[PDB]
């Protein structure tokens, strides 16, 4: 077993969408080049402030399989290290990433070589063949444990977060707006209401968890979890919200405005269809 | 007789300080100027620090409480300034911030002054604490 049991995260890891973007692109191209989903290996860079680690960017590494062992071209990694120096100074190496499922007895070999380079590398593994609705990205750290009298390096899962800036947020929001359309338009409202469906599902799952906790407290658990059940009941008392004449008036105002806009759009489509029909009819029987 | 830039700075600084203690600084405005006019020529950091303290004092006196608080706050995070003087300069920054015109700039300074732990040591620590926390 390469996974440590009972070991909690010692540092906080912040991940950016660009890192996941690099991993996905690396896996796709290698799959396209060599058929099956060939495992990819790259490196992680970013800023580290004490125990707070922020992974802002990531890049690829050259590796070779010799004696059924993955040998990372650290010389290429070092050649690429000064290459990224020429563009960015504030970004420092933080760890390496790969693709696959559970850790295999080859990633430990990769990690020990990366641990040789720097003081403390971070290990990230992405699962491109996942089927659940959760993020198939996990961050692991290096821990030394005495197993059967021998010091064996293990991986401890880290409770990383997803940190992003206003820029990236707006950018990917409009990337989703652009995916809402396309050359091969299958459906648009389908994707829209599927997105709302996923959001409502997340909220419903939260409500189910709260209700289950309340029922358990009624049965066992803590009879009163203090501020938690207090705030839960208060929020359930704010569920009605209560609108005023002005809010309903403004809601109906916006609805009427955009409905009039929709009516105008339907009129435009209908008049275009009428123009096409008239153009065809003027050729069907009419002259001049 | 080319008085070394420090000497002209020292003389003009002394006139401004003398006028500040007498409070007729219509001329000390013109004297903190001619101190400033040749200020960006001098070398002595301590003289520069002594200038910025006097310049911040001039801002505090006229109407520039918001600007003096900015200058005092900039001088607060120094090292060659005595710790007692650093606390005094920050205390001057806190008093000027409270007395300045209540606006966006003053609100930001109140937020900035709610970071120093030596602000907490001051007696007016409560005053801005109620202030910035909207009381």
């Amino acid at each position: 077993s390469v996974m440590a049991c009972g070991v909690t995260g010692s540092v906080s890891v912040a991940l950016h969408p660009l890192v996941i973007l690099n991993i996905s692109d690396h896996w796709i191209r290698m799959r396209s080049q060599e058929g099956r989903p060939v495992q990819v290996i790259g490196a992680l860079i970013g800023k580290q402030e004490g125990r707070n680690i922020e992974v802002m960017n990531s890049f690829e590494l050259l590796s070779h399989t010799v004696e059924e062992k993955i040998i990372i071209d650290k010389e290429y990694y070092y050649t690429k290290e000064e290459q990224f120096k020429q563009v960015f100074k504030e970004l420092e190496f933080l760890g390496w990433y790969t693709t696959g499922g559970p850790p295999d007895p080859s990633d430990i070999h990769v990690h020990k070589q990366v641990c040789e380079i720097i003081e403390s590398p971070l290990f990230l593994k992405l699962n491109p063949m996942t089927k659940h609705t959760d993020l198939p990205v996990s961050v692991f750290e290096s821990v030394i444990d005495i197993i059967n009298g021998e010091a064996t390096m293990l991986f401890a899962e880290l409770t990383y977060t997803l940190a992003t800036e206003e820029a990236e947020r707006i950018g990917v929001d409009h990337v989703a707006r652009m995916t809402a359309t396309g050359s091969g338009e299958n459906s648009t409202v389908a994707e829209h209401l599927i997105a709302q469906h996923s959001a409502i599902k997340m909220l419903h799952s939260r409500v189910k968890l709260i209700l289950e906790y309340v029922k358990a407290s009624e049965a066992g658990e803590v009879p009163f979890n203090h501020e938690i059940l207090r705030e839960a009941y208060a929020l359930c008392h704010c569920l009605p919200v209560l609108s005023t004449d002005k809010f309903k008036t403004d809601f109906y105002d916006q609805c009427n405005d955009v409905g009039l806009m929709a009516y105008l759009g339907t009129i435009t489509k209908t008049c275009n269809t009428m123009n096409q029909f008239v153009n065809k009819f003027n050729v069907l029987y009419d002259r001049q | 007789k080319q008085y070394n830039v420090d000497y002209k700075l020292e003389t003009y600084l002394k006139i401004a300080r003398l006028y500040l203690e007498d409070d007729d600084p219509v001329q000390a405005e013109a004297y903190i100027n001619r101190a400033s006019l040749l200020q960006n020529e001098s070398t002595n950091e301590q003289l520069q620090i002594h200038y910025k303290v006097c310049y911040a004092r001039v801002l505090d006196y006229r109407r520039k409480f918001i600007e003096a608080a900015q200058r005092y706050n900039e001088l607060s995070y120094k090292t060659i300034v005595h710790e007692s003087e650093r606390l005094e300069a920050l205390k001057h920054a806190l008093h000027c911030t409270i007395l300045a015109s209540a606006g966006q700039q003053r609100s930001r300074m109140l937020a900035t002054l709610f970071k120093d732990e030596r602000c907490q040591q001051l007696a007016a620590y409560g005053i801005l604490e109620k202030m910035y926390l909207d009381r």
């Binding site: 996941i20 973007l21 290429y76 820029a167 947020r169 989703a176 435009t268 | -």
Partner: protein, 309 residues
């Protein structure tokens, strides 16, 4: 097949580069398809900049009348927007970057250059035009991409343009819709001038697995409050501009039709008028679907939250 576009066919690219069909037509390249990755990287770099122009190189390929951008990378250069062919200062760097990229399986070569116009729209200035002209003198198939990171944020819609220059002396044909941009006083003067000067490439893009990963992750959390109001279209600048352009287009169509009623036997005029009317109708329609989807999301969510029980 969503991932078909990611397949690189080197011999096919060599065949296209030997054929040079763009020499037969200065309007040959009409479409610009951009991957998610490239666009995201570019936007991020430009916004880190903030109010200063940055630039970089785009890696990709060609496919018929379509230019395809697969990836991009920043260039460590000074004088973007002031120096003609500023990219030239990074020549050595570009050679090494690409060499190292080839070592890790990046097979696509240089397809263009991108740079930012923070808060002044997306167009080609006299300098940009000189640079892209030189970039189309030695590397004819080159696309210039311009991004406004500031307007992207303020408008809530990606502000990007793809452009190609005309050779010295060559005049554009009758068509040129030219969407108006709110560039500053003198910047807009020069903008009208260079919109008359170059030609834009229809932004096409492609939904892929890169896009699938992004849309899914950001919507889950950055949109825990899937609210974000619901109408970033409330700003009467984009929809209103489209409405005004629609009105101008249909007014010109009517003006053409009125004069065309006197000439008996002009089929081309009828064809052009019908096509213009159809294009205007589709533009208005797509605006209508956008508004309707916005209102639908708004209605469902606000009804649920305000009056669930």
């Amino acid at each position: 097949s969503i991932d078909e576009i990611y397949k690189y066919d080197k011999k096919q690219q060599q065949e296209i580069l030997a054929a040079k069909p763009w020499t037969k037509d200065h309007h040959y390249f009409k479409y610009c398809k951009i991957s998610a990755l490239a666009l995201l990287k570019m936007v991020m770099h430009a916004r880190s900049g903030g109010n200063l122009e940055v630039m970089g190189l785009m890696l990709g390929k060609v496919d018929g009348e379509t230019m395809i951008i697969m990836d991009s990378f920043a260039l460590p250069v000074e004088g973007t927007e002031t120096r003609v062919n500023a990219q030239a200062a990074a020549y050595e760097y570009m050679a090494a970057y690409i060499e190292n990229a080839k070592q890790v399986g990046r097979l696509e070569n240089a397809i263009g250059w991108y740079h930012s116009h923070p808060g002044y729209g997306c167009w080609l200035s006299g300098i940009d035009v000189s640079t892209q002209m030189l970039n189309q003198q030695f590397q004819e198939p080159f696309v210039a991409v311009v991004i406004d990171p500031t307007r992207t944020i303020s408008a809530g819609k990606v502000n990007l343009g793809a452009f190609r220059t005309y050779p010295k002396g060559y005049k554009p044909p009758d068509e040129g819709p030219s969407e108006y941009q709110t560039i500053p006083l003198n910047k807009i003067e020069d903008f009208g001038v260079h919109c008359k000067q170059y030609y834009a490439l229809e932004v096409s893009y492609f939904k892929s697995s890169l896009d699938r990963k992004l849309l899914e992750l950001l919507w889950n959390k950055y949109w825990v409050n899937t609210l974000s109001s619901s109408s970033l279209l409330t700003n009467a600048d984009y929809t209103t501009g489209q409405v005004f352009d629609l009105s101008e287009k249909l007014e010109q169509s009517e003006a053409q039709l009125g004069r065309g009623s006197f000439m008996l036997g002009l089929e081309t005029h009828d064809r052009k008028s019908e096509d213009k009317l159809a294009k205007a109708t589709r533009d208005s329609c797509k605006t209508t679907i956008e508004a309707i989807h916005g209102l639908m999301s708004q209605v469902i969510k606000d009804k649920l939250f305000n009056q669930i029980n």
